[PDB]
Design a protein around this ligand. Structure first.
Ligand SMILES: [Mg+2]
Length: 291
């Protein structure tokens, strides 16, 4: 009715200056040609860091999703409001963008005030959109929260995520969005399913849990060729979600499906080594919808 089909995907579009050989441009095209990216209402991207590769990706999906936000933290242009700890002086944007098949009526970027000082060179945060479907409004917040960084510390990473999630939920409450409109909150939330922290996330984001489908992890060194390479030893975890605020209208029966679609194999002929991969990113995308 106003309920949406969404995808969220951390696309691993690292800086092509710092990480020249991660197939960023090749993957921007493959993602655009994929099936999972198609036939949704709204797509949330995370780790759209490299400006050129990210803009290519966004361009690759513009015909289907003509209404697009800028990428979080790139500049103040194109936003209805910029808030949080927005910095001109950070070399890296926040990598979050939202595209929509339906007109975006309002777009706000919020760079997180909470974070870690020895990788604070990112405008990480959330992007809020109000979207009009069938003359009615629906709200989508896309985000990407503090990674499990071995330098900041596990305990600190968890506290950072808590505060960042509270920034989102505070934003939602202060926005005074009428309770008869749904507010989706999704992205790479970096909290593993089935953990003590997971219960905290539901409270801090003010969301209900969802029904799950498909694969049982979203970052999976056992089946994903990119994750496998980077962290051969890694435990698969389920880190990407799309939830709705629990005090606003609920979808009929929200599902999060972890999609394991793979592109045709693609290579990087680095001077040092040759490598072949067959994933869009080191994370799998989530598709959310109600059946
Ligand atoms: Mg990552």
């Amino acid at each position: 009715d106003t309920d949406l089909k969404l995808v969220s995907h951390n696309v691993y579009m690292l800086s092509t200056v710092l990480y020249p050989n991660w197939g960023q441009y090749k993957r921007a095209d493959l993602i655009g040609q994929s099936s999972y990216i198609k036939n949704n209402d709204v797509v949330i991207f995370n780790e759209a860091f490299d400006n050129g590769a990210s803009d290519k990706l966004l361009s690759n999906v513009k015909k289907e999703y003509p209404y697009q936000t800028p990428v979080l933290g790139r500049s103040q242009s194109g936003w209805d409001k910029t808030e949080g700890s927005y910095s001109s002086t950070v070399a890296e944007d926040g990598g979050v963008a939202i595209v929509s098949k339906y007109p975006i009526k309002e777009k706000i970027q919020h760079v997180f005030k909470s974070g870690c000082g020895f990788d604070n060179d990112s405008n990480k945060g959330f992007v809020y959109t109000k979207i009009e479907k069938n003359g009615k409004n629906v709200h989508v917040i896309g985000t990407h929260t503090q990674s499990e960084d071995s330098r900041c510390g596990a305990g600190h990473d968890r506290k950072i995520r808590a505060e960042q999630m509270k920034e989102i939920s505070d934003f939602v409450k202060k926005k005074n969005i009428p309770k008869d409109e749904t507010v989706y909150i999704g992205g790479d939330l970096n909290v593993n399913k089935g953990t003590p922290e997971f219960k905290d996330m539901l409270k801090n984001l003010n969301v209900n849990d969802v029904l799950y489908a498909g694969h049982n992890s979203t970052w999976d060194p056992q089946s994903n060729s990119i994750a496998k390479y980077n962290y051969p030893n890694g435990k698969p975890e389920h880190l990407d979600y799309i939830f709705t605020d629990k005090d606003h209208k609920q979808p009929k029966q929200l599902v999060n499906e972890v999609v394991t679609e793979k592109p045709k194999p693609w290579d990087v002929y680095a001077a040092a080594y040759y490598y072949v991969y067959n994933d869009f990113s080191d994370h799998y995308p989530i598709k959310a919808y109600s059946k």
